mmCIF file of C-alpha atoms and ligand atoms in Angstrom:
data_model
loop_
_atom_site.group_PDB
_atom_site.id
_atom_site.type_symbol
_atom_site.label_atom_id
_atom_site.label_comp_id
_atom_site.label_asym_id
_atom_site.label_seq_id
_atom_site.Cartn_x
_atom_site.Cartn_y
_atom_site.Cartn_z
ATOM 1 C CA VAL A 1 -30.343 136.914 -50.295
ATOM 2 C CA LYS A 2 -32.627 138.018 -53.172
ATOM 3 C CA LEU A 3 -32.062 140.897 -55.399
ATOM 4 C CA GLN A 4 -35.093 142.140 -56.892
ATOM 5 C CA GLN A 5 -35.070 144.483 -60.119
ATOM 6 C CA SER A 6 -37.880 146.636 -61.321
ATOM 7 C CA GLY A 7 -37.741 149.427 -63.990
ATOM 8 C CA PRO A 8 -39.145 150.115 -67.450
ATOM 9 C CA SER A 9 -38.398 147.862 -70.471
ATOM 10 C CA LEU A 10 -38.353 150.451 -73.114
ATOM 11 C CA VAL A 11 -36.622 153.806 -73.391
ATOM 12 C CA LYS A 12 -36.195 156.451 -76.474
ATOM 13 C CA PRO A 13 -32.693 157.290 -77.804
ATOM 14 C CA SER A 14 -31.053 160.229 -75.759
ATOM 15 C CA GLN A 15 -33.162 159.612 -72.793
ATOM 16 C CA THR A 16 -32.277 158.417 -69.580
ATOM 17 C CA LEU A 17 -32.503 154.560 -68.368
ATOM 18 C CA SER A 18 -33.219 154.195 -64.667
ATOM 19 C CA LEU A 19 -33.377 150.773 -62.680
ATOM 20 C CA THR A 20 -33.951 149.662 -59.336
ATOM 21 C CA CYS A 21 -32.251 146.797 -57.356
ATOM 22 C CA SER A 22 -34.157 146.047 -54.152
ATOM 23 C CA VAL A 23 -31.842 143.864 -51.945
ATOM 24 C CA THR A 24 -33.650 141.920 -49.443
ATOM 25 C CA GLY A 25 -31.288 139.443 -47.575
ATOM 26 C CA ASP A 26 -28.076 141.585 -46.939
ATOM 27 C CA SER A 27 -27.667 145.184 -46.335
ATOM 28 C CA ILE A 28 -26.382 147.588 -49.228
ATOM 29 C CA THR A 29 -23.896 148.995 -46.363
ATOM 30 C CA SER A 30 -21.898 145.826 -46.623
ATOM 31 C CA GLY A 31 -19.675 144.722 -49.104
ATOM 32 C CA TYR A 32 -20.055 145.711 -52.599
ATOM 33 C CA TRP A 33 -23.029 145.804 -55.230
ATOM 34 C CA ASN A 34 -22.602 146.090 -59.118
ATOM 35 C CA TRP A 35 -24.663 146.403 -62.149
ATOM 36 C CA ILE A 36 -23.750 144.220 -65.211
ATOM 37 C CA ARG A 37 -25.570 144.169 -68.573
ATOM 38 C CA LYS A 38 -25.460 141.474 -71.174
ATOM 39 C CA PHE A 39 -25.610 142.490 -74.788
ATOM 40 C CA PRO A 40 -27.466 140.440 -77.208
ATOM 41 C CA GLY A 41 -24.257 138.898 -78.756
ATOM 42 C CA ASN A 42 -23.671 136.946 -75.204
ATOM 43 C CA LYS A 43 -21.302 139.570 -74.180
ATOM 44 C CA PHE A 44 -21.125 140.741 -70.492
ATOM 45 C CA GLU A 45 -20.227 144.176 -69.562
ATOM 46 C CA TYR A 46 -19.188 145.359 -66.102
ATOM 47 C CA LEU A 47 -20.946 148.707 -65.737
ATOM 48 C CA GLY A 48 -19.810 149.592 -62.165
ATOM 49 C CA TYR A 49 -20.216 149.101 -58.398
ATOM 50 C CA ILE A 50 -21.375 151.067 -55.519
ATOM 51 C CA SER A 51 -19.477 150.495 -52.316
ATOM 52 C CA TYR A 52 -20.720 149.750 -48.825
ATOM 53 C CA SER A 53 -19.292 153.302 -47.575
ATOM 54 C CA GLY A 54 -20.803 154.988 -50.883
ATOM 55 C CA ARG A 55 -17.803 154.863 -53.123
ATOM 56 C CA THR A 56 -18.471 154.132 -56.647
ATOM 57 C CA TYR A 57 -16.676 152.886 -59.689
ATOM 58 C CA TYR A 58 -17.892 153.291 -63.213
ATOM 59 C CA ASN A 59 -16.431 151.516 -66.406
ATOM 60 C CA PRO A 60 -14.448 153.939 -68.699
ATOM 61 C CA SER A 61 -16.350 152.417 -71.600
ATOM 62 C CA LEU A 62 -19.455 154.152 -70.555
ATOM 63 C CA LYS A 63 -17.680 157.565 -70.486
ATOM 64 C CA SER A 64 -19.758 159.548 -67.734
ATOM 65 C CA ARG A 65 -22.980 158.446 -68.924
ATOM 66 C CA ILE A 66 -23.663 156.357 -65.931
ATOM 67 C CA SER A 67 -24.465 157.352 -62.249
ATOM 68 C CA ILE A 68 -25.009 154.588 -59.670
ATOM 69 C CA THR A 69 -26.940 155.683 -56.636
ATOM 70 C CA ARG A 70 -28.014 153.854 -53.296
ATOM 71 C CA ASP A 71 -30.652 154.582 -50.956
ATOM 72 C CA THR A 72 -29.226 153.259 -47.401
ATOM 73 C CA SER A 73 -32.614 153.378 -45.828
ATOM 74 C CA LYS A 74 -34.876 151.205 -48.408
ATOM 75 C CA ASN A 75 -31.915 149.016 -48.817
ATOM 76 C CA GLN A 76 -31.678 149.855 -52.627
ATOM 77 C CA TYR A 77 -29.588 150.983 -55.422
ATOM 78 C CA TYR A 78 -30.094 152.351 -58.601
ATOM 79 C CA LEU A 79 -28.809 152.276 -62.239
ATOM 80 C CA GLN A 80 -28.854 155.615 -64.645
ATOM 81 C CA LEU A 81 -27.463 155.702 -67.959
ATOM 82 C CA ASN A 82 -27.870 159.177 -69.828
ATOM 83 C CA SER A 83 -28.085 159.512 -73.527
ATOM 84 C CA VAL A 84 -29.316 155.973 -74.143
ATOM 85 C CA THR A 85 -28.602 155.320 -77.727
ATOM 86 C CA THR A 86 -29.464 151.778 -79.326
ATOM 87 C CA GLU A 87 -26.025 150.232 -78.445
ATOM 88 C CA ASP A 88 -27.341 150.235 -74.990
ATOM 89 C CA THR A 89 -29.750 147.523 -75.576
ATOM 90 C CA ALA A 90 -28.993 144.679 -73.298
ATOM 91 C CA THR A 91 -30.290 142.755 -70.448
ATOM 92 C CA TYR A 92 -29.094 144.623 -67.223
ATOM 93 C CA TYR A 93 -28.494 142.786 -63.944
ATOM 94 C CA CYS A 94 -27.755 143.852 -60.414
ATOM 95 C CA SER A 95 -25.430 141.391 -58.586
ATOM 96 C CA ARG A 96 -23.490 140.983 -55.429
ATOM 97 C CA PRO A 97 -19.950 140.205 -55.274
ATOM 98 C CA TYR A 98 -18.835 138.438 -52.097
ATOM 99 C CA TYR A 99 -15.442 138.736 -50.293
ATOM 100 C CA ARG A 100 -15.382 134.917 -49.283
ATOM 101 C CA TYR A 101 -15.051 133.995 -52.706
ATOM 102 C CA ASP A 102 -12.803 136.703 -53.593
ATOM 103 C CA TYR A 103 -15.665 138.799 -55.161
ATOM 104 C CA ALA A 104 -17.090 136.287 -57.334
ATOM 105 C CA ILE A 105 -20.704 136.812 -57.872
ATOM 106 C CA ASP A 106 -22.986 134.671 -56.018
ATOM 107 C CA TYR A 107 -26.484 136.321 -56.106
ATOM 108 C CA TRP A 108 -28.084 137.779 -59.327
ATOM 109 C CA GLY A 109 -31.241 139.790 -59.800
ATOM 110 C CA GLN A 110 -33.569 138.445 -62.284
ATOM 111 C CA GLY A 111 -32.490 141.003 -64.927
ATOM 112 C CA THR A 112 -34.431 143.612 -67.023
ATOM 113 C CA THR A 113 -34.548 143.565 -70.749
ATOM 114 C CA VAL A 114 -34.133 147.057 -72.019
ATOM 115 C CA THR A 115 -34.799 147.943 -75.518
ATOM 116 C CA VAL A 116 -33.880 151.390 -77.087
ATOM 117 C CA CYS A 117 -36.383 152.069 -79.998
ATOM 118 C CA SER A 118 -35.189 154.720 -82.487
ATOM 119 C CA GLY A 119 -38.920 155.438 -83.706
ATOM 120 C CA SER A 120 -37.821 157.957 -86.224
ATOM 121 C CA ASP A 121 -41.115 157.919 -88.331
ATOM 122 C CA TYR A 122 -41.849 161.478 -88.319
ATOM 123 C CA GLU A 123 -41.665 161.935 -92.009
ATOM 124 C CA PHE A 124 -43.818 158.589 -92.616
ATOM 125 C CA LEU A 125 -46.679 158.922 -90.047
ATOM 126 C CA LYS A 126 -47.305 162.628 -90.982
ATOM 127 C CA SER A 127 -49.564 161.348 -93.775
ATOM 128 C CA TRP A 128 -51.852 159.640 -91.501
ATOM 129 C CA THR A 129 -54.952 160.553 -89.882
ATOM 130 C CA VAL A 130 -55.324 159.599 -86.187
ATOM 131 C CA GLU A 131 -58.087 157.404 -87.292
ATOM 132 C CA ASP A 132 -55.613 155.762 -89.717
ATOM 133 C CA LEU A 133 -53.038 155.733 -87.110
ATOM 134 C CA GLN A 134 -55.362 153.680 -84.615
ATOM 135 C CA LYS A 135 -56.164 151.057 -87.326
ATOM 136 C CA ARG A 136 -52.132 150.785 -87.850
ATOM 137 C CA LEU A 137 -51.706 150.393 -84.145
ATOM 138 C CA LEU A 138 -54.233 147.626 -84.131
ATOM 139 C CA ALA A 139 -52.825 145.924 -87.089
ATOM 140 C CA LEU A 140 -49.929 144.801 -85.126
ATOM 141 C CA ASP A 141 -51.959 142.416 -82.971
ATOM 142 C CA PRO A 142 -52.594 139.963 -85.669
ATOM 143 C CA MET A 143 -49.192 140.363 -86.957
ATOM 144 C CA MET A 144 -47.579 139.724 -83.374
ATOM 145 C CA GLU A 145 -49.964 136.815 -82.731
ATOM 146 C CA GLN A 146 -48.545 135.118 -85.935
ATOM 147 C CA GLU A 147 -45.039 135.279 -84.762
ATOM 148 C CA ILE A 148 -45.939 133.938 -81.499
ATOM 149 C CA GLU A 149 -47.727 131.137 -82.850
ATOM 150 C CA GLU A 150 -44.811 130.080 -85.125
ATOM 151 C CA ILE A 151 -42.815 130.112 -81.745
ATOM 152 C CA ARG A 152 -45.355 127.998 -80.082
ATOM 153 C CA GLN A 153 -45.487 125.314 -83.177
ATOM 154 C CA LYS A 154 -41.983 125.376 -83.545
ATOM 155 C CA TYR A 155 -41.542 123.844 -80.013
ATOM 156 C CA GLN A 156 -44.556 121.731 -80.677
ATOM 157 C CA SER A 157 -42.377 119.875 -83.101
ATOM 158 C CA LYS A 158 -39.314 120.024 -81.232
ATOM 159 C CA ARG A 159 -40.657 118.394 -78.290
ATOM 160 C CA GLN A 160 -42.743 115.775 -80.312
ATOM 161 C CA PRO A 161 -39.572 113.499 -80.707
ATOM 162 C CA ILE A 162 -39.255 113.669 -76.644
ATOM 163 C CA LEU A 163 -42.858 112.686 -76.001
ATOM 164 C CA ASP A 164 -42.586 109.906 -78.552
ATOM 165 C CA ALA A 165 -39.499 108.661 -76.673
ATOM 166 C CA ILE A 166 -41.355 108.815 -73.159
ATOM 167 C CA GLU A 167 -44.363 106.659 -74.445
ATOM 168 C CA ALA A 168 -41.850 103.978 -75.498
ATOM 169 C CA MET B 1 -5.214 147.806 -69.951
ATOM 170 C CA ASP B 2 -8.327 145.553 -69.431
ATOM 171 C CA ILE B 3 -7.891 141.903 -68.938
ATOM 172 C CA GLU B 4 -9.339 140.197 -71.883
ATOM 173 C CA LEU B 5 -10.895 136.520 -71.474
ATOM 174 C CA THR B 6 -11.038 134.343 -74.601
ATOM 175 C CA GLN B 7 -13.060 131.341 -74.481
ATOM 176 C CA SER B 8 -12.721 128.197 -76.684
ATOM 177 C CA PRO B 9 -14.455 126.866 -78.258
ATOM 178 C CA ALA B 10 -17.382 129.416 -78.578
ATOM 179 C CA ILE B 11 -19.970 126.526 -79.155
ATOM 180 C CA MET B 12 -19.377 122.846 -78.805
ATOM 181 C CA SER B 13 -21.727 119.976 -79.113
ATOM 182 C CA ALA B 14 -21.449 116.724 -76.863
ATOM 183 C CA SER B 15 -23.210 113.563 -76.522
ATOM 184 C CA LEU B 16 -24.152 112.759 -73.001
ATOM 185 C CA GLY B 17 -21.616 110.641 -70.914
ATOM 186 C CA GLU B 18 -18.847 112.199 -72.799
ATOM 187 C CA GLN B 19 -15.933 114.195 -71.028
ATOM 188 C CA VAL B 20 -15.865 117.759 -71.909
ATOM 189 C CA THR B 21 -13.202 120.495 -71.294
ATOM 190 C CA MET B 22 -13.715 124.212 -72.071
ATOM 191 C CA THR B 23 -10.777 126.713 -71.663
ATOM 192 C CA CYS B 24 -10.515 130.462 -70.832
ATOM 193 C CA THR B 25 -7.151 132.292 -71.462
ATOM 194 C CA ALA B 26 -6.414 135.722 -70.314
ATOM 195 C CA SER B 27 -4.234 138.472 -71.910
ATOM 196 C CA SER B 28 -2.382 138.718 -68.514
ATOM 197 C CA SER B 29 -1.810 136.764 -65.457
ATOM 198 C CA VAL B 30 -4.512 136.507 -62.777
ATOM 199 C CA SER B 31 -4.034 134.816 -59.760
ATOM 200 C CA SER B 32 -5.989 131.539 -59.356
ATOM 201 C CA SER B 33 -8.223 132.909 -56.693
ATOM 202 C CA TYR B 34 -9.899 135.441 -58.815
ATOM 203 C CA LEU B 35 -10.634 133.179 -61.952
ATOM 204 C CA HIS B 36 -14.454 132.120 -61.844
ATOM 205 C CA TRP B 37 -16.846 130.168 -63.763
ATOM 206 C CA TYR B 38 -20.648 130.973 -64.355
ATOM 207 C CA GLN B 39 -23.278 128.782 -65.785
ATOM 208 C CA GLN B 40 -26.238 130.330 -67.496
ATOM 209 C CA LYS B 41 -29.382 128.417 -69.074
ATOM 210 C CA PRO B 42 -31.825 130.617 -71.068
ATOM 211 C CA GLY B 43 -34.730 132.644 -69.161
ATOM 212 C CA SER B 44 -32.710 132.905 -66.112
ATOM 213 C CA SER B 45 -29.756 134.680 -64.531
ATOM 214 C CA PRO B 46 -26.021 133.234 -64.318
ATOM 215 C CA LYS B 47 -25.282 130.931 -61.454
ATOM 216 C CA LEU B 48 -21.836 131.068 -59.983
ATOM 217 C CA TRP B 49 -20.425 127.589 -60.725
ATOM 218 C CA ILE B 50 -16.845 127.556 -59.841
ATOM 219 C CA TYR B 51 -14.998 130.164 -57.819
ATOM 220 C CA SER B 52 -11.306 130.769 -57.416
ATOM 221 C CA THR B 53 -10.271 128.413 -60.080
ATOM 222 C CA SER B 54 -10.997 125.209 -58.021
ATOM 223 C CA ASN B 55 -14.087 125.465 -55.754
ATOM 224 C CA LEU B 56 -17.559 124.164 -56.535
ATOM 225 C CA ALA B 57 -20.482 126.747 -55.651
ATOM 226 C CA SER B 58 -23.178 124.653 -53.370
ATOM 227 C CA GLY B 59 -25.457 122.566 -55.560
ATOM 228 C CA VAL B 60 -22.827 121.976 -58.547
ATOM 229 C CA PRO B 61 -22.613 118.483 -59.249
ATOM 230 C CA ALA B 62 -19.352 116.645 -58.530
ATOM 231 C CA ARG B 63 -18.902 115.941 -62.214
ATOM 232 C CA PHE B 64 -17.840 119.548 -62.720
ATOM 233 C CA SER B 65 -13.999 120.200 -62.140
ATOM 234 C CA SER B 66 -11.962 123.131 -62.961
ATOM 235 C CA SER B 67 -8.198 123.809 -63.069
ATOM 236 C CA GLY B 68 -5.451 126.404 -64.133
ATOM 237 C CA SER B 69 -3.238 129.091 -63.223
ATOM 238 C CA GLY B 70 -1.598 132.427 -64.713
ATOM 239 C CA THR B 71 -2.996 132.943 -68.246
ATOM 240 C CA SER B 72 -4.928 129.620 -68.944
ATOM 241 C CA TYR B 73 -7.745 127.988 -67.084
ATOM 242 C CA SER B 74 -10.323 125.244 -67.888
ATOM 243 C CA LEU B 75 -13.663 123.835 -66.893
ATOM 244 C CA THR B 76 -14.297 119.973 -67.283
ATOM 245 C CA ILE B 77 -17.452 117.837 -67.413
ATOM 246 C CA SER B 78 -16.604 114.023 -66.491
ATOM 247 C CA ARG B 79 -19.836 112.304 -67.722
ATOM 248 C CA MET B 80 -22.140 115.049 -69.202
ATOM 249 C CA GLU B 81 -25.770 114.891 -68.694
ATOM 250 C CA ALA B 82 -28.696 116.574 -70.628
ATOM 251 C CA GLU B 83 -28.962 119.383 -68.116
ATOM 252 C CA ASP B 84 -25.426 120.483 -68.329
ATOM 253 C CA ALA B 85 -26.746 121.991 -71.713
ATOM 254 C CA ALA B 86 -25.960 125.635 -71.013
ATOM 255 C CA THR B 87 -23.691 128.448 -71.412
ATOM 256 C CA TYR B 88 -20.348 128.914 -69.466
ATOM 257 C CA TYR B 89 -18.680 132.076 -68.833
ATOM 258 C CA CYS B 90 -15.231 132.663 -67.155
ATOM 259 C CA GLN B 91 -14.839 135.928 -65.284
ATOM 260 C CA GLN B 92 -11.883 137.538 -63.439
ATOM 261 C CA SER B 93 -12.744 139.628 -60.382
ATOM 262 C CA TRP B 94 -9.079 141.015 -59.952
ATOM 263 C CA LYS B 95 -8.472 144.172 -62.245
ATOM 264 C CA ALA B 96 -11.452 146.514 -62.674
ATOM 265 C CA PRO B 97 -13.574 146.420 -64.775
ATOM 266 C CA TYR B 98 -13.949 142.780 -63.974
ATOM 267 C CA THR B 99 -14.327 141.230 -67.552
ATOM 268 C CA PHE B 100 -16.210 138.250 -68.417
ATOM 269 C CA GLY B 101 -15.384 135.630 -71.327
ATOM 270 C CA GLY B 102 -17.299 135.401 -74.213
ATOM 271 C CA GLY B 103 -18.971 132.244 -73.014
ATOM 272 C CA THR B 104 -19.063 128.636 -74.302
ATOM 273 C CA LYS B 105 -22.518 127.254 -75.296
ATOM 274 C CA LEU B 106 -22.405 123.558 -74.790
ATOM 275 C CA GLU B 107 -25.226 121.827 -76.686
ATOM 276 C CA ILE B 108 -26.256 118.143 -76.969
ATOM 277 C CA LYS B 109 -24.966 116.562 -80.055
ATOM 278 C CA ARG B 110 -27.978 115.119 -81.922
ATOM 279 C CA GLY B 111 -30.419 115.754 -79.320
ATOM 280 C CA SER B 112 -33.204 116.672 -81.521
ATOM 281 C CA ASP B 113 -33.630 113.148 -82.921
ATOM 282 C CA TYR B 114 -35.792 110.205 -81.926
ATOM 283 C CA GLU B 115 -33.178 107.917 -83.114
ATOM 284 C CA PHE B 116 -30.859 109.107 -80.287
ATOM 285 C CA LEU B 117 -33.548 110.260 -77.779
ATOM 286 C CA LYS B 118 -35.036 106.924 -77.041
ATOM 287 C CA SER B 119 -31.846 105.706 -75.289
ATOM 288 C CA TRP B 120 -32.162 108.256 -72.506
ATOM 289 C CA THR B 121 -33.866 107.451 -69.154
ATOM 290 C CA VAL B 122 -37.262 108.588 -68.737
ATOM 291 C CA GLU B 123 -35.815 111.280 -66.177
ATOM 292 C CA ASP B 124 -33.317 112.649 -68.457
ATOM 293 C CA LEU B 125 -36.241 112.810 -70.863
ATOM 294 C CA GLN B 126 -38.745 114.527 -68.844
ATOM 295 C CA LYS B 127 -36.143 117.114 -67.611
ATOM 296 C CA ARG B 128 -35.232 117.734 -71.179
ATOM 297 C CA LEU B 129 -38.802 118.227 -72.114
ATOM 298 C CA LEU B 130 -39.510 121.024 -69.418
ATOM 299 C CA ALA B 131 -35.945 122.609 -70.331
ATOM 300 C CA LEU B 132 -37.758 123.632 -73.518
ATOM 301 C CA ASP B 133 -40.064 126.080 -71.699
ATOM 302 C CA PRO B 134 -37.523 128.825 -70.830
ATOM 303 C CA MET B 135 -36.226 128.880 -74.343
ATOM 304 C CA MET B 136 -39.767 129.186 -75.926
ATOM 305 C CA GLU B 137 -40.608 131.997 -73.476
ATOM 306 C CA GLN B 138 -37.521 133.845 -74.216
ATOM 307 C CA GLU B 139 -38.303 133.794 -77.927
ATOM 308 C CA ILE B 140 -41.947 134.945 -77.263
ATOM 309 C CA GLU B 141 -40.917 137.802 -74.656
ATOM 310 C CA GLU B 142 -38.443 138.982 -77.416
ATOM 311 C CA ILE B 143 -41.131 139.462 -79.763
ATOM 312 C CA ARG B 144 -43.678 141.171 -77.459
ATOM 313 C CA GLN B 145 -40.784 143.699 -76.572
ATOM 314 C CA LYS B 146 -40.137 144.254 -80.221
ATOM 315 C CA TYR B 147 -43.850 145.193 -80.899
ATOM 316 C CA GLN B 148 -43.704 147.513 -77.899
ATOM 317 C CA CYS B 149 -41.083 149.010 -79.943
ATOM 318 C CA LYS B 150 -43.234 149.102 -83.305
ATOM 319 C CA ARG B 151 -46.016 150.406 -81.097
ATOM 320 C CA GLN B 152 -44.112 153.268 -79.950
ATOM 321 C CA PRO B 153 -44.034 155.818 -82.617
ATOM 322 C CA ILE B 154 -47.718 155.186 -83.445
ATOM 323 C CA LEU B 155 -48.661 156.388 -79.947
ATOM 324 C CA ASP B 156 -46.168 159.053 -80.189
ATOM 325 C CA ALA B 157 -47.984 160.203 -83.513
ATOM 326 C CA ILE B 158 -51.566 159.884 -82.363
ATOM 327 C CA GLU B 159 -50.701 162.337 -79.451
ATOM 328 C CA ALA B 160 -48.775 164.777 -81.691
ATOM 329 C CA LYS B 161 -52.319 166.054 -82.588
HETATM 330 O O1 E9R C 201 -11.132 145.990 -50.159
HETATM 331 C C1 E9R C 201 -10.771 145.770 -51.195
HETATM 332 N N1 E9R C 201 -11.343 146.195 -52.297
HETATM 333 C C2 E9R C 201 -10.818 145.948 -53.435
HETATM 334 C C3 E9R C 201 -11.847 146.077 -54.386
HETATM 335 C C4 E9R C 201 -13.310 145.379 -53.851
HETATM 336 C C5 E9R C 201 -14.015 144.448 -54.756
HETATM 337 C C6 E9R C 201 -14.617 145.300 -56.094
HETATM 338 N N2 E9R C 201 -15.299 144.334 -57.162
HETATM 339 C C7 E9R C 201 -14.500 143.330 -57.439
HETATM 340 C C8 E9R C 201 -15.135 142.340 -58.285
HETATM 341 C C9 E9R C 201 -16.555 142.416 -58.558
HETATM 342 C C10 E9R C 201 -17.222 141.630 -59.528
HETATM 343 O O2 E9R C 201 -16.552 140.603 -59.943
HETATM 344 C C11 E9R C 201 -17.159 143.718 -58.178
HETATM 345 O O3 E9R C 201 -18.560 143.718 -58.473
HETATM 346 C C12 E9R C 201 -16.456 144.598 -57.291
HETATM 347 C C13 E9R C 201 -9.756 146.818 -54.192
HETATM 348 O O4 E9R C 201 -8.611 146.809 -53.644
HETATM 349 O O5 E9R C 201 -9.903 147.434 -55.085
HETATM 350 O O6 E9R C 201 -9.839 144.681 -51.388
#
């Protein structure tokens, strides 16, 4: 049983998030199938399930912004979140509860980390020529690479005691 | 009225070989067959670890045990090992929405010190060395997606012409 996720990683506010779980080891016409998201603060939120017959359940917390959709023929099911603010930034999981375990969740998709970008820079980026903007766009590359290099070196030190301890 | 699951402590550090017991307390009774436990290491998805209060998922080593009933449940490691360093979530699959606990992150006490490190076996050492890569990759990937966020309004202004 392998739940395979696909979908975009970014979504602008008040737009719609859409994700796809491609089940490959069971049939979505059997049992239940849910969507669950993990907020950055290590907090899980049950979003809802699609049933074997097609009935659904939606967390009241999401109001009515969520609709879960199945495609019985391709053994897929879909998550759709409307009017997506930045409080919808999380890692989104599909997963199969199993009746034999009283619906404990024994299989999980690999997740999709979904960011919501306000992007309210109309008033700033207006005083830029398109040529200035394409320099600004390329300005991010050395900036990001710097951060990534800090990460890489942090773990260069964090593992050094381990390598020293192995040599001994 | 949703069932709140509270996990204490939220974080706890333990030295190898210790015996560690983390707890989960519900706001209202849940029958034992619906209380479950998951383990999540960074970079990968939660794994079902214990279902129905007292059943180990396959592959879960025997040093793990769990018990409880009513509104108080618990998970116990007998002789902790380096690889049990993870976050452990309880979950009830009884009343929808099927709520999780806040987690318990179990870290290795004084794990980042050559003083303590050289007393480990070579196996626990090289398993721990490789356990660093998922952590690093999550951090790098969080950076890459932050810059796709920064790249966005620039691309929206370049084409607003
Ligand atoms: O036939 C029966 N139906 C049940 C609901 C079925 C299970 C719904 N459910 C539970 C738990 C999880 C995740 O923990 C999940 O994704 C979905 C009932 O009576 O409502 O019995």
